[PDB]
Subunit: 246 residues, 6 copies
Amino acid sequence: YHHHYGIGAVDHAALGDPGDGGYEARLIAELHRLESAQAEFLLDHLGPVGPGDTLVDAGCGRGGSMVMAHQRFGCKVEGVTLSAAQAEFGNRRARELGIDDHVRSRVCNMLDTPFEKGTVAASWNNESSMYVDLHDVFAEHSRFLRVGGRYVTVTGCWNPRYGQPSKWVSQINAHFECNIHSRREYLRAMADNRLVPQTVVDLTPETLPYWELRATSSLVTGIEEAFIESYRDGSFQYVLIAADRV
Amino acid sequence: YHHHYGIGAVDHAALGDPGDGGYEARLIAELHRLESAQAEFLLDHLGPVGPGDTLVDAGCGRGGSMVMAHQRFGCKVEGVTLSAAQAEFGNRRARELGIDDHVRSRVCNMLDTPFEKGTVAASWNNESSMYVDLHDVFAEHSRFLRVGGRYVTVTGCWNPRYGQPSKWVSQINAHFECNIHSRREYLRAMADNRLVPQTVVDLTPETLPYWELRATSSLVTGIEEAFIESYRDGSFQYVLIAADRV
Amino acid sequence: YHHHYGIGAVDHAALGDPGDGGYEARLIAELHRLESAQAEFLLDHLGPVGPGDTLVDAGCGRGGSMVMAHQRFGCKVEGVTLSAAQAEFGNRRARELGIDDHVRSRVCNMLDTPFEKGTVAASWNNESSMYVDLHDVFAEHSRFLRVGGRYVTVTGCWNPRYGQPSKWVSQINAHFECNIHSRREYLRAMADNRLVPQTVVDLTPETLPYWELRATSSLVTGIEEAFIESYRDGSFQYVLIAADRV
Amino acid sequence: YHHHYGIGAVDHAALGDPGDGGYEARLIAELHRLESAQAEFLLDHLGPVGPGDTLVDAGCGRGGSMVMAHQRFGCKVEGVTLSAAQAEFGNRRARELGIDDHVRSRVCNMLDTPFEKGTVAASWNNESSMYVDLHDVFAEHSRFLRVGGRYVTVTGCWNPRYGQPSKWVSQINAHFECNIHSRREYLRAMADNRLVPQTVVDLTPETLPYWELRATSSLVTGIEEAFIESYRDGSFQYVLIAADRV
Amino acid sequence: YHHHYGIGAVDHAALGDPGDGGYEARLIAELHRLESAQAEFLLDHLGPVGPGDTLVDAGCGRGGSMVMAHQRFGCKVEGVTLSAAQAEFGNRRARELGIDDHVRSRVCNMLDTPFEKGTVAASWNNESSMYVDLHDVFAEHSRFLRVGGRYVTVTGCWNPRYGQPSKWVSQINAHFECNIHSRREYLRAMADNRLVPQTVVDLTPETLPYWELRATSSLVTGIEEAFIESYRDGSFQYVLIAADRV
Amino acid sequence: YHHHYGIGAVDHAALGDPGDGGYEARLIAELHRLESAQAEFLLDHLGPVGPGDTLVDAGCGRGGSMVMAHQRFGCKVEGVTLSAAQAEFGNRRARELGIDDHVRSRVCNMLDTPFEKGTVAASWNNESSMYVDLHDVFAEHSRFLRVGGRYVTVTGCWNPRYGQPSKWVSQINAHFECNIHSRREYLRAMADNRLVPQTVVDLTPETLPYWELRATSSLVTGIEEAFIESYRDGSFQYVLIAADRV
């Protein structure tokens, strides 16, 4: 369901015996529970959003975070993705839940959205910033975000502390055909776009259990080794940055 | 003893009856305990500093954080202050503890220190950055800090989210004859000086109990109202920023 | 009447005997005369503005400078203030003078005005820039000012030559709940916004008599000591900067 | 022998019959001939270097370009590599040729070399810039290069015209554990370091034959497909940039 | 006919005997042939422009390059000049050729054109950039150029390698009342406006024959000595820069 | 004697009858008197320099301003010129006056002087900045100037208000083989080098009489028409900028 990753300790008690026929079903559910905790945590950083505010999810995938945002704040949520299938599923889902009047996904590039200047209360990129130019996406968020608005991103980034990106990070780039940025670029791009971090938290230790668990599932895609190893040697990190549009 | 402030819930049980003659003595001790928790927390962000590393405390006051740093990591600690009395006390103290061969304070401006380029493992400004130009002090820290080194600052800063600095912040500036900077300047100055935040945490809710407690003591200086009120309306905030020199 | 300050030597002969019952009335009139000389001097720097040009007064107060500008150049003058009372008074005044078809005040933030790009011949901030972000206000002036237009500001600013702002400057900030900027920021902000100083003149010696005089009047608000002392030790200065929009 | 790549049409006549036992030996020699043409072309862009000038090769590998430079200009050549084996081989080689008094390799990081400010006439990175931060390496070259000196680089870079780096580029990064930069970064980094391009030439069409040939040899390492495909779809390009230190 | 200059070796055989009465007519034709080769070369750098694309010629003169562009690509071509006579001639010419539905010139400043954002495929300044501010003209080209579009300029520029501009360059500035820029400014301005050079080629040796030839004609204006001498001592250079709008 | 120009009204009474044989001698003396008033005015902006301070004159010519500076402040004065003859004359002159122990000229480029960082109290470029790169010369002044030091420049600059430099300015560039900068560059370069204008005054009306007078003398060099005409149409201006090193 979710395209982003999870955080939090794994509930091994819930998993039970790996021998059971339903183990894989309890595992996928655990992965899901960790991803929900992640989105929930991202939401904790959006500030006091209200029923009349508009929120924007850049790279919304299936619209799950949008649904969570609305149920939590009762506000309007606009999502953007380049996948027609993802947008369609999200909207069908929204209609079936009877909230399609508040939540909507559309096919559009996150670098040039239809949202008017200063009309969005809060916005975010959950695992979707590693695909685009940071200065350009932050410049767009800074444009539609009202002064005083809140921007949040949960993303993996290489650690400039260990120098250039490790082979593991490059392996991830080649797997998703993305372009993971260094933590230095994230902070620089924000500063250049009137985005001032209020919170920066390294969630690497929190997301490691999610990946080790996934590496033992039938959900493996062959890239979990790059994630785990880079997270462990410190060259790659998972972080949440909450910033104010000033 | 400490020139910086505290964080953490107040132990009212420890305080006891305000009627006792020793209440004031238990209160000052509580304030002290909260300040120690603050320095300890700052230390948790210096990374894995070792016995052979050199640490720099810019605006070290009486040298208490330096003493804590050495006992915790066993490394060398150099402190800088403009107060001859403070430096002298710190060094006497260090000698009496038998660690003057590891810990030393000296009278010097934090904008032009004698430390050689790339020789310091970690450094920090604890409540002392609100006195100097941020670009210049971060440029100096960036100069002596080795590539990969860690810089930490605990400081009060006005929130650019509410616009220009409030009267409360100005009242604080006039009380200490300092120049509190906005959170935007802190992040901008770091980005311009090869300092990349690894952690940014708003400790405002954590330091509020310390000030409310101090406002009921005989330690009042008349400025605690500005602190408390600005911390409450959000115009002023207490934050910890840990950054890597890259 | 005027919200800005004055420049020029005090006419003690005019003041006469402090014992007279009308001394205070002659004093207030003297203060007024010095303020008018100030506005007049600001006007001398607007260039050859004509009857068909449009001028903008950011932070116009009661509209007095606007009235002076029109009578002098016969042009149109648009004023901006956040005070509904001030705007209303200014417009009533304009109507009574029969120039409301040329001079108008409105309630609006000076950072986001309704004036169209490149349509204003000259504009200014008279004692009103110490309240807002300099880059943002100069960016707005630069936007509506035609290429070749003239921008002028008369303002107090702390002197970066003596380092960080003195307690006196902070006391002023706390009194008006403003945010006095250093002279370095004024010049930097202009350079970053296509505003090129044609004239920069330190009027500190010229405005000192105005304040010393006010400090002996019943108009005292308790802040004249901060002004006088900072003007005297050089930490605070009163300057006029006339710049071209290029 | 050479660590960099080649340019120029393949001499199929020279290759002869693939059935011969010596085909592979003629092929490797052809690859070599194309690489020599590349180094020769890089040398054509160093300007009129003379016998008394000093040249620096950053990431010199086995020192082959250095040897070529000396024989061509008779000047002194200093090389830098992180490989002790490579440096040792290069120096042995130089001694055997009787030019070790002019050509020398040493183990050192190209970001912090021992060369004094403004003492080098020309310098270059041949296929070695994709490993380091561009601003930092150009800043170092700009430091030891005399005013008026010449800097040259032959490198692969992703094309910002097609957006973010393609999977092919990422595959190359993962293969060499490097960090290929976009052409935009190359030009930006130079401009920020007083390096002004005099020549920028896309050699992609010229280097394609070298790779297609290598892809049919026993020298294959499995990465030639990424090179060829990205060179063909335009996402990756091979370029020469010659710039003046001004 | 053409306002720009030429490149290529002179066909002395074509010129024939200087004694003939038609020598001057064959010379002017030769100059013309060299100018056409120049425009043709500029066109080779516009990329794969098609019939449905729109091209912009900033400082189009008589519209000759525009005519060439259309016949070559069949696309639409918009030209801008400040000369009403030049625009009128170009359009008459276009009508007579029956291509006025594709090619059009208009009187307009190249710093503020009517072309909509991101609608132009390629654009250029042929010998016309030495008249305007580089940052401003590149900013305008960058505005109407679509992402991925191509910008080309052929221009003379002083060489920052020899320091400040030579007397020869100044003599040229005074002759045309223009403002020749250094090669450093060209590259800097492009980098600041999202224009990334794909090709930079010094055509000085190629344009020298054109000027020496013109210096022997009845077309002399007295400035050919400044051109030739500065081209020869290296202080002035003729270059082509092709860049991508990214 | 002086290489810089003058300011102030011409004393026609002193000139007397143009018919006298000594008219030319009284004229040259008048020109001299106006130049001395200029240097004197520049000196009024150096601040409270004392006997123990060191002053630097970049592009000192014959050392006349240096001599004036010493006699006025009694301080040490170091001069820099590229003319061996000028330096020698200045020093001979200084010795003959018995002040060679305080005033000294030397042959050196003003972009790389031997003065140690932060050791100079005040410095200046009198009519010599139009020859060098502004960022580089201001960066050098900023380097040896102590924090709080004063920098002053009297120079001609083109007015960015009228767009690109006029033919007159170019004619001046060609006459002296210099590179007059726009007023925008002067202010920008200062801001980028920690130089904050304290005074900016347009002396164009004050220097016009000096040039009109010179245009009627036997001292004409043929360039006075460019000066006078550009000063009159506003495209060229003579200004004094006094700035603090902060």
